[PDB]
Amino acid sequence: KTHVQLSLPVLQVRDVLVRGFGDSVEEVLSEARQHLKDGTCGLVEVEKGVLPQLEQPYVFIKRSDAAPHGHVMVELVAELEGIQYGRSGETLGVLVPHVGEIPVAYRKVLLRK
Numbered sequence: 001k002t003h004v005q006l007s008l009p010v011l012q013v014r015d016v017l018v019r020g021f022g023d024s025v026e027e028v029l030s031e032a033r034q035h036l037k038d039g040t041c042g043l044v045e046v047e048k049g050v051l052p053q054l055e056q057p058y059v060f061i062k063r064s065d066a067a068p069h070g071h072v073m074v075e076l077v078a079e080l081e082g083i084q085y086g087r088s089g090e091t092l093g094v095l096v097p098h099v100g101e102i103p104v105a106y107r108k109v110l111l112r113k
Contacts, residue, residue, distance in 0.1 A: 001113070003073070003110050003111065003112055003113065004036075004037075004110070004113050005068075005069065005071050005108070005110055006036060006041075006071075006109050006110075006111055007106045007107070007108050008042060008043040008095075008106065008109060009042050009043070009098055009101075009103035009105075009106060010042070010043050010044070010045060010093070010103050010104050010105040010106065010107055011042040011043070011044055011098070011101045011103055011104070012044075012101075012104060013044050013050045015102070016042070016054070016096050016101060017097075017099050018096060018097040018099055019053070019054045019096060020054060020056065020057070020058070020059075020096065021035070021057075021059060021095070021096070022057075023057075024057065025057050025078045025080050025085045027057075028057045028058070028059050028078055029059060029076055029078050029085070031097075032059040032076055033076070035095070035097055035098070036095070036111055036113075037113075040097060040098050040099075041095055041096075041097070041098055042096050042097070042103070043061065043092065043094070043095060043096075043107050044093050044094045044095075044096055045092075045093045046060075046091050046093055050094070051094065054094055054096065056079070056080050056081070057078050057079060057080040058078065058079040058080075058094050059076055059077075059094065059095040060076070060077045060078075060079065060092075060093070060094055061074040061075070061076060061091070061092045061093060061095060061111075062074060062075060062076075062077050062086075062088030062089050062091055062092065063088070063089035063090045063092060064088055064089060064112060065089075066089075067110075069108075070108045071108045071109055071110035072092065072107075072108065072109055072110065073109075073110045074088075074092060074109045074110065074111060074112070075088045075111075076095075076111075092107060093107065
């Protein structure tokens with residue numbers, strides 16, 4: 001399928017054990033896609049003082065449309081030293097590996113894959 005219904009566990013930034021997907025724009029987008037597919041991807045909601053606690057390059061999920069079965073359509077945009085790779089709508093959060101942290105909520109997304 002071109003789109004996949006996912007429920008992403010929302011993690012507090014201070015709980016996150018693995019604070020990024022890797023060391024290049026291409027690697028983090030690759031790793032984010034694999035974790036999204038394997039159900040091993042968490043979401044941190046972006047606020048003041050969140051991003052400097054996470055590792056660049058960042059992977060964002062961004063609203064791609066204005067929401068089937070409650071799932072907001074999103075796509076991936078990466079960021080490194082203030083340059084973004086991709087063009088999309090409003091940020092829903094930054095993706096990180098999920099390694100068993102207890103979530104505070106779930107974000108239903110429809111991922112363009």
